[PDB]
């Protein structure tokens, strides 16, 4: 005997926030399931970000550009925070060329996702405040990765006296939930509610990430249950 559940329901208030519920369960078993999911989800997914920058007329991370209200440091620092998305698979790494040449306030979505391979989710972020007359040329590199990498490792890519490497936070997830509570019939017990929540950046719906986490976890237990090589 094994009280197997079948109730897996999705409700999906938005493109990025979703709920899930798991019904009915044998006692003390859902905590295990959910905490395993929480760890793997929040640890080991895959994303994209920007790494390298080449500004015209600046040579190092402490310069200043005429007519631009921020340092180069703050340009890099806030460029760090811009979350992205694919539209096509197989997009490995990309280089971009922005030429802002008008009396503007330079914002995120103002980035023409001019490469067909890729796009920006968060468009309404303020990169910088130009004057009426500043002219700025920038060149981007966006690449895929996992977890977190600091700057100096990204010194690998050929500074060429101009390139500045930047930090890169790759994780595509922002918040995770699970909670459990009993449900019952009169005199007969052992009904369990698991209620779970996934909050992402919008680069991918909750279902794909949840599926991938479970695929990796089953891939781990598979070897560790069947194959039994001995000493």
């Amino acid at each position: 005997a094994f009280q197997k559940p079948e109730n897996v329901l999705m409700m999906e208030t938005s493109d990025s926030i979703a709920k899930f519920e798991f019904k009915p369960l044998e006692p003390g078993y859902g905590i295990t399931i959910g905490n395993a999911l929480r760890r793997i989800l929040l640890s080991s997914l895959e994303g994209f970000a920007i790494t390298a920058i080449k500004i015209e007329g600046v040579e190092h991370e402490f310069a200043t550009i005429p007519g631009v209200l921020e340092d180069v440091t703050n340009i890099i620092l806030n460029l760090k925070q811009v979350r992205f998305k694919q539209i096509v698979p197989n997009a490995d790494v990309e280089k971009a060329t922005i030429v802002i040449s008008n009396s503007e306030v330079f914002r995120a979505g103002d980035l023409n996702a001019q490469l067909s391979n890729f796009e920006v989710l968060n468009s309404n972020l303020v990169i910088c405040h130009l004057d009426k007359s500043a002219t700025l040329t920038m060149e981007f590199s966006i690449n895929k990765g996992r977890g977190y990498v600091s700057a100096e490792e990204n010194r690998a890519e050929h500074n060429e006296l101009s390139t500045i490497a930047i930090d890169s936070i790759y994780t595509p997830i922002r918040n995770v939930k699970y909670a459990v509570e009993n449900f019952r019939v009169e005199q007969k017990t052992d009904y369990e509610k698991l209620l779970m929540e996934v909050t992402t950046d919008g680069s991918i719906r909750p279902v794909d990430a949840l599926r991938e986490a479970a695929q990796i976890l089953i891939s781990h237990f598979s070897l560790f249950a069947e194959n039994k090589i001995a000493i």
Partner: protein
């Protein structure tokens, strides 16, 4: 300076992060030093994630 002809100079700057061994403090005497950089998962997390 009278006896010398010239003096040259260079500036060197370093951008410095945190790592284990650095010192921290607060406004009430709590001197301390960083012991371990914990990954975000296993930090004790409240009922709202």
């Amino acid at each position: 300076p009278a006896g010398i002809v010239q003096m040259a100079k260079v500036y060197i700057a370093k951008k410095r992060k945190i790592q284990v061994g650095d010192k921290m403090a607060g406004r009430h005497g709590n001197k301390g030093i960083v012991s371990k950089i914990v990954r975000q998962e296993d930090m004790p997390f409240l009922a709202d994630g």
